[PDB]
Amino acid sequence: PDMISVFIGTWNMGSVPPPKNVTSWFTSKGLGKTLDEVTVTIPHDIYVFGTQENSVGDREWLDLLRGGLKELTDLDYRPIAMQSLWNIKVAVLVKPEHENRISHVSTSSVKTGIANTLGNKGAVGVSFMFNGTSFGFVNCHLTSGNEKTARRNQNYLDILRLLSLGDRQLNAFDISLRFTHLFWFGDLNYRLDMDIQEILNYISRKEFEPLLRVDQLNLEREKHKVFLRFSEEEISFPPTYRYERGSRDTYAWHKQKPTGVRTNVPSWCDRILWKSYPETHIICNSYGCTDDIVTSDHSPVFGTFEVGVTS
């Protein structure tokens, strides 16, 4: 073809296995810029899944994917690559009609953290050539905590510099330049710079712009300190973190435990960003979160893209 559809899913699963049905994730049905207004489920050319706090072993986890897509699309999707760094996992699967259109499949992982305290923070990446065009997919999980924006940016640049995706002719290059299309997603862990009470009312009024204007990620992009020249689809879905398990009508922003009280204001922790080489084309058609996948204190986020490929 000339254009291809690429699904990207990122989901911090909360150290807890997924439920049997996660169709909503795969089909971009939920809140935000969604595909609720389609009934024929049209398969995508490439499926990319990023997860954080994944308790499922690497082998078992790719089976569920392969199966969920076979049951949704009737096609035996071929897995191209998988990378894990402890509980950070990414997998890429492809429509069988494109298996031999793919080459130079690379994988890498990097453990961010100058004295990374728990040490489950880092990234995993895969890169490959679809016909003549090269792709990169970075799934990461950066430093947690409301006040740790500085550590998150340092993690970003550490991933940026120390991750060896693609082949080694691209090495003086940096990741934002090694690839035709570079998708960066995961639990970036940036939070809202506002007090609990105002955040909740804005969410209850469905007024998201006053919240997005104090989102830490947006702020540090606007200070030109991270993700320089990356794009993000505008966000029109509620913060995906953090919910009580069981449902999606309760932000667990102040739960007391024998390990200390945790005050995490609702935030858009889970993001899909992208950067393309100039004069190359890419359009985002969905960007949202599900509202029925309840196993995790995060809700999964989806993004679909039409991407141009050569031949």
Side-chain angles (χ1 to χ4, degrees), residues 1-2 4-58 60-65 67-77 79-311:
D2 187 34
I4 65 160
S5 54
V6 177
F7 174 97
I8 310 202
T10 173
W11 186 24
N12 179 325
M13 294 178 319
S15 304
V16 153
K20 190 38 153 183
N21 194 208
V22 289
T23 295
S24 293
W25 198 23
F26 294 178
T27 40
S28 307
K29 297 190 279 198
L31 304 180
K33 184 168 187 175
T34 78
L35 299 173
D36 299 333
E37 295 192 315
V38 184
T39 47
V40 54
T41 287
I42 299 105
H44 295 289
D45 306 288
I46 301 195
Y47 280 87
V48 185
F49 294 102
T51 59
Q52 310 76 50
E53 315 267 25
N54 190 330
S55 33
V56 180
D58 307 349
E60 286 89 327
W61 179 61
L62 180 62
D63 306 281
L64 297 158
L65 305 167
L69 300 78
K70 170 64 173 169
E71 179 113 14
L72 276 167
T73 75
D74 317 321
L75 311 160
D76 305 80
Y77 270 75
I80 280 172
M82 155 168 296
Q83 187 57 46
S84 84
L85 174 68
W86 300 17
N87 311 283
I88 305 153
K89 307 169 191 287
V90 65
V92 174
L93 310 98
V94 153
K95 258 188 171 185
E97 43 176 301
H98 312 296
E99 51 193 0
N100 281 20
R101 278 167 224 187
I102 282 139
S103 64
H104 293 84
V105 176
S106 190
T107 57
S108 191
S109 85
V110 70
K111 330 80 194 166
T112 42
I114 182 140
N116 195 340
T117 41
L118 196 155
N120 63 338
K121 261 67 182 202
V124 289
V126 308
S127 55
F128 56 90
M129 304 274 313
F130 194 105
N131 287 325
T133 76
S134 59
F135 286 85
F137 296 86
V138 176
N139 169 50
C140 73
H141 182 23
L142 319 167
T143 295
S144 185
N146 226 293
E147 300 311 279
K148 310 256 189 174
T149 290
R151 254 91 149 189
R152 281 186 280 282
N153 303 343
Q154 182 66 33
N155 296 348
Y156 168 71
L157 305 156
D158 284 336
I159 296 169
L160 209 56
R161 267 256 154 218
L162 273 46
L163 185 76
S164 53
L165 262 195
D167 210 277
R168 40 195 185 270
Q169 321 60 19
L170 301 309
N171 94 89
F173 272 170
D174 207 339
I175 273 179
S176 37
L177 216 167
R178 293 184 204 170
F179 303 110
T180 307
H181 305 291
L182 172 60
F183 299 88
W184 194 310
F185 49 95
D187 190 353
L188 277 62
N189 243 327
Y190 291 95
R191 317 301 183 91
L192 284 192
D193 274 335
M194 201 166 65
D195 75 278
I196 175 58
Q197 293 189 56
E198 294 280 35
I199 298 178
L200 294 174
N201 307 335
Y202 279 132
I203 294 166
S204 296
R205 299 180 173 272
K206 309 233 79 180
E207 299 196 50
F208 297 131
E209 315 77 49
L211 306 185
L212 296 162
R213 288 184 317 184
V214 302
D215 162 51
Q216 274 159 6
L217 184 46
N218 288 345
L219 290 174
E220 312 286 316
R221 296 252 302 304
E222 294 162 336
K223 316 205 213 194
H224 285 46
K225 292 206 284 188
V226 287
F227 285 101
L228 290 182
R229 310 187 156 261
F230 282 67
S231 314
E232 179 165 33
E233 193 63 43
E234 75 161 46
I235 294 181
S236 70
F237 53 96
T240 62
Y241 172 89
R242 76 175 292 176
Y243 295 91
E244 292 242 0
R245 334 232 171 186
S247 75
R248 300 285 91 156
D249 54 19
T250 298
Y251 282 108
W253 66 270
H254 187 282
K255 231 161 59 171
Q256 199 134 20
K257 282 153 139 287
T259 73
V261 52
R262 300 329 192 191
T263 169
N264 299 266
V265 284
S267 304
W268 292 278
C269 291
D270 320 303
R271 301 271 229 115
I272 297 172
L273 294 156
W274 75 90
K275 178 174 166 46
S276 270
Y277 229 80
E279 306 214 303
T280 69
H281 260 313
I282 171 181
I283 63 107
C284 165
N285 290 324
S286 63
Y287 191 37
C289 71
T290 68
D291 57 17
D292 66 327
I293 294 163
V294 153
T295 45
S296 165
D297 62 329
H298 301 245
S299 297
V301 162
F302 45 79
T304 53
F305 306 78
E306 272 295 322
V307 184
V309 302
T310 42
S311 50

